[PDB]
Structure formats: C-alpha cells, structure tokens
Amino acid sequence: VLYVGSKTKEGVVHGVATVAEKTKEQVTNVGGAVVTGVTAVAQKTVEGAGSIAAATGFVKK
Amino acid sequence: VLYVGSKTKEGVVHGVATVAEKTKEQVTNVGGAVVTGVTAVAQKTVEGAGSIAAATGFVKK
Amino acid sequence: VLYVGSKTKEGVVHGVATVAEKTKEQVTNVGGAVVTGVTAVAQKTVEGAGSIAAATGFVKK
Amino acid sequence: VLYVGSKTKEGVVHGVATVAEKTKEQVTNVGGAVVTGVTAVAQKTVEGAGSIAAATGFVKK
Amino acid sequence: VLYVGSKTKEGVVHGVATVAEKTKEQVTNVGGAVVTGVTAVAQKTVEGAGSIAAATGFVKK
Amino acid sequence: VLYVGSKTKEGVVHGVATVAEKTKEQVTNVGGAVVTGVTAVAQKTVEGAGSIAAATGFVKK
Hints:
The first copy, chain A, is an all-beta fold. The first copy, chain A, is built from no helices and eight strands. Chain A has strands at residues 2-8, 12-20, 25-30, 34-36, 39-43, 46-47, 52-53, 56-60. Chains in contact: A-B, A-C, A-D, B-C, D-E, D-F, E-F. At the A-B interface, strand 1, strand 2, strand 3, strand 4 and strand 5 of A face strand 1, strand 2, strand 3, strand 4 and strand 5 of B. Chains A, B, C, D, E, F: Belongs to the synuclein family.
C-alpha cells in the first residue's frame, strides 16, 4: 500500500546529463530503469533462486 | 494498490540528453525502459528460476 | 489496481535527444520501450525459467 | 505502509552530472535505479539463497 | 510503518558531481541506487543465507 | 515506528563532490547507497547466515 500527493507553483528538473570536449574514451552505464517528472514513482520485484546482475564499464582481454 | 495525484501551474521537464564535439568513441547504454512526463509511473515483475541481466558498455577481444 | 489523475495550466516536455558535431563513432542504445506525454504510464510482465536480457553498446572480435 | 506529502513555492534539482575536458579514460558506473523529481520514492526486494551483485569499474587481463 | 512530511519556501539540491581536466585515469563507483529530490525516501530488503556484495574500483594482472 | 517533520525558510545542500586537476590515478568508491534532500531517510535489513561485505579501493597482482 503506497500513497503520494503534491502541490507546487513552479519547478524545473534534469535527469542524467553528459558533456565531453576532446576525450578519447568516455562511458556512462546504468543497470536499472530511469524515471523522471515533477512527481516520480518506481517499483520492482524478482522471485526465484540464483539471480545475478553485473553492471560493468568495459573489459580488455 | 497504488494511488497518485497532482496539481501544478507551470513546469518544464527533460529526460536523458547527450552532446559530443570531437570525441573518438562515446556510448550511452540503458537496460530498463525510459518514462517521462509531468507525472510518470512505471512497474515491472519477473517470475521463474535462473534470471540474468547483463548491461555492458563495450568489449574488445 | 492502479489510479492516476492530473490538472495543469502550462507545460513543456522532451524525451531522448542527441547532438554530435565531428565525432567518429557515437551510439545511443535502449532495451525497453520509450514512453512520453504530459501524463505517462507503462507496465510489463514475464513468466518462465531462464529469461535473458542483453543490452550492449558494441563488440569487436 | 508508507505515507508521504509535500508543499513548496520554488525549487531546482539536478540528478547526476559529468564534465571531462582532455582526460584519456573516465568511467561513471551505477548498479541500482536512478530516480529523480521534486518528490522521489524508490523500493526493491529480492528472495532466494544464491543472490549476487558485482558493480565493477573495469578489468585488464 | 513510516510517516514523513515537509513545508519549505526555497531550496537547491545537487546529488553526485565530478569534474576532470587532464588526469590519466579517474573512477566513480556506487553499489546501491542514487535517490535525490527536495524530499527523498529509500528502502530495501534481502532474504536467504550466503548473500554477497563486492563494490570494487579496478583490478590488474 | 519512525516519525519525521521539518520547517525551513532557506537551505542549500551538496551530496558528494570530487575534483582532480593533474593526478595519475584517483578513485572514489562507496559500498552502500547515496541518498540526499532537504529531508532524507534511509533503511536496510538482511536475514540469513554467513553474509559478506568487501568494499575495496584497488588490487594489484
């Protein structure tokens, strides 16, 4: 059971942002969802044994 | 059970954004969904053994 | 069971956006849906063992 | 059970940001969700023995 | 059971920030979620023996 | 049971920051979650036996 409510006159919002000028290699990496607004709500659930999650930037062999 | 409600006079919203001028390689990578508005809601569920998720930037052999 | 409601006088919204000036390689990559509006809602469900998801930027052998 | 409520006249929010000029290599890596707004709420649950999470910057073999 | 409430006239919030000019290598790494707003709430739970978490900067051999 | 309330005319908050001009290697690493606002709340729970947590800077072989 979840209840949320809100009131506002003004507002401005920014999520993820990136700038690069002269870089050779640059990485932005995310595993979940990305959710955005004046009001934002997010939920998840997983069931069963042996679950794995593996957020990784890069690999060189 | 989920309940959401909202009231507002003004607002401005931005999701994911990216700029690159002279970079050699650049990557933006996301594993879930992307949801955006003045009000935004998102939900997910997974069932059964041995679930896997593997969000990766890049690989070189 | 889900309930959502809204009232607003003015508003402006932007989804995913990209700019590249003189770059050699650039990649924007997404695994779910992209949903956008003044009000936005999204739902998903998966059933059965051995589910797999594999959002990857690029690969060089 | 969770209850939340808010009242505000003005506000400005920034989620995650990044600037890089002449660096050779640079990485931003995150394992969970990113959630943002004037009001933000986030929840997760996992059930089972073999549970693993492995957030890593990079590897060189 | 949790109850939270707020009233405020003005406010400014910055979550995570990072700036790099001429560095060879630079890493920011996080194991959980990132949550940010004028009011912010986060919760989590894990069930079952032998649970592992291993947030690491980098490895070389 | 937990209860929280607040009242404020003005406030400014910075979560985590990092600056590096000419360094060879710099690492910022965190094993938990990062949570930030004018009012902020965080909670965790683990049940079982034989748990491990291993937050580390870097390793060289």
